[PDB]
Amino acid sequence: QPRKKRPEDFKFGKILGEGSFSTVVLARELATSREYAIKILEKRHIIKENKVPYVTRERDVMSRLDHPFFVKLYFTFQDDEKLYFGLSYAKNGELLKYIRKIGSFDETCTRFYTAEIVSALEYLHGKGIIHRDLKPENILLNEDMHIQITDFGTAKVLSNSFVGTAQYVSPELLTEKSACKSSDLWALGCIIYQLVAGLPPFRAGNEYLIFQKIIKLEYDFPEKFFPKARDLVEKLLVLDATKRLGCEEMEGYGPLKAHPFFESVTWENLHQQTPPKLT
Amino acid sequence: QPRKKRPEDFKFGKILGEGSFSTVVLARELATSREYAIKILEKRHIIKENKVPYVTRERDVMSRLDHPFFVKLYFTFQDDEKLYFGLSYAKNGELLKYIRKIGSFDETCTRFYTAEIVSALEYLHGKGIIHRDLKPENILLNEDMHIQITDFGTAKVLSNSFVGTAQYVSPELLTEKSACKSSDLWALGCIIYQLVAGLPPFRAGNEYLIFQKIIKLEYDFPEKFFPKARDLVEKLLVLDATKRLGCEEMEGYGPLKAHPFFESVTWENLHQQTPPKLT
Ligand SMILES: NC(=O)c1nn(CC2CCNCC2)c2c1CCc1cnc(N=C3C=CCC=C3)nc1-2
Ligand SMILES: NC(=O)c1nn(CC2CCNCC2)c2c1CCc1cnc(N=C3C=CCC=C3)nc1-2
Secondary structure (H helix, E strand, C coil): CCCCCCHHHEEEEEEEEECCCCEEEEEEECCCCCEEEEEEEEHHHHHHCCCHHHHHHHHHHHHHCCCCCECCEEEEEECCCEEEEEECCCCCCEHHHHHHHHCCCCHHHHHHHHHHHHHHHHHHHHCCEECCCCCCCCEEECCCCCEEECCCCCCEECCCCCCCCHHHCCHHHHHCCCCCHHHHHHHHHHHHHHHHHCCCCCCCCCHHHHHHHHHCCCCCCCCCCCHHHHHHHHHHCCCCHHHCCCCHHHCCHHHHHCCHHHCCCCHHHHHHCCCCCCC | CCCCCCHHHEEEEEEEEECCCCEEEEEEECCCCCEEEEEEEEHHHHHHCCCHHHHHHHHHHHHHCCCCCECCEEEEEECCCEEEEEECCCCCCEHHHHHHHHCCCCHHHHHHHHHHHHHHHHHHHHCCEECCCCCCCCEEECCCCCEEECCCCCCEECCCCCCCCHHHCCHHHHHCCCCCHHHHHHHHHHHHHHHHHCCCCCCCCCHHHHHHHHHCCCCCCCCCCCHHHHHHHHHHCCCCHHHCCCCHHHCCHHHHHCCHHHCCCCHHHHHHCCCCCCC
16 A cells, blocks of 8 residues: 555645535645545544444445546545545536536436436445435536545445435435435436426425425426436336335336436446536 | 456456566456456466566555556456456557657657656655666556556565666666666666657667667767757766766755756646647
């Protein structure tokens, strides 16, 4: 291994994000000029808040990922007070930013980015890992406009407890306190809807009211919604977790990737394809 | 760590190179579509030829390198017969190919590529590692036309034995059977000469005759040779290894990088600069 890095090996720059248990700062490694997104965590605060298992799991999951559509963990170190995780820097920020910038994605762009997300999930679920907080805020865009999925703090490694962002919460988490690969597939359905409609499907004044719409499958499609994309969403936003397209009970990613909405997709080498320009 | 890769995780393609103890093949990882240059070594042949220390050292050195101007080792595995080293793939091949293609480099191109090599050597020598076989054949170009230095089989980790390619052999290897950081600096002088002149400085009908010219410092500069580049070469091709610019006895890379030939170079972020077009 290269000798352990230290804070003094980097020139730290702007803060990219501030979480409850961490801060992500852009850093330039002096010896190389390379930019990393360095996630910084305070050991005392992690201990106080009983987050050792979560931080441990985050590091362990990221160490297992080796795929172009995921954030890469390059190095870790620590000083007396802090843990530092050296991550890939995705220069273009949140997918959510582009949804808002252009309002909604046309069909070509919806297809391409949905295909990248499905392909990332196939990889992740193949490793028996579930994300549990998938949303446009956690799906970043690199300099080449390919996705990089981030935020593995709340991931689960398959062998209750955590519920992610309200708008993307699957009904089984609300009704049975239980998560599975299918919870990510529900979130995928919500994300596809958001790409096409410009907004997530379940929206209300507060969390309780959102949860109420989720468990009743209370959402509708706007008129212009790409018909094949609507059919795919209807196959993902299914209350029964065992009937969601892509899940093991529905025989996996084969049938999901075979959906008519993806007819023109070449699944083999998405990361080497040029992304369509966002309007 | 990601679970160990296997040959069946890759579609192997063309042979990029065939050495005495290894073959490098271009491979595409099925799960990711990523291309790697996979160096393949036959355990039986390595054992027969007493190369275990060299292969061991090669792996150990590459594992220590984390710099944009060096080949990266991404993974290793083995089957019953073979060792596999997953390396970065430099798509544009040997620097030597461009020297031959354009005949010789203009001053701007000579400066930029010499600066990348010096910056790579500063990194490498800072880790107490010496290359010992530096030449345009071992300096590759990536897709963005930045260098990637390869071939660490014959490297030495500082704490006799090996002499590299005849034309780049330093006089102390011939006279004292001894290597040091300064042997790489001699090779750098030969490479700069080759960039500007189109041919290496010491040339003869056979190895003996080459070695004879090296120990007598028998070479000359063609008329048009960039004056400041000539001055730099004269400071590197010095028979006394302790008087070569860049060596510890001459106070290191500071004075080398300060040479007038590099006046307009920004040393900080060469890998993020756009390389000058080769004529
Ligand atoms: N929580 C994280 O792991 C994380 N948080 N950020 C910062 C923002 C990302 C989008 N949502 C709010 C937090 C990162 C990461 C992973 C590693 C990572 C890599 N690159 C970026 N890039 C950004 C570029 C522009 C704006 C924000 C982030 N960001 C991160
Ligand atoms: N010996 C090695 O380690 C090695 N050999 N090659 C193949 C040729 C390189 C130039 N000299 C003859 C052997 C490689 C490597 C490192 C890893 C490596 C990475 N990328 C390339 N790329 C090439 C592209 C076009 C032609 C040849 C090589 N090559 C290699």
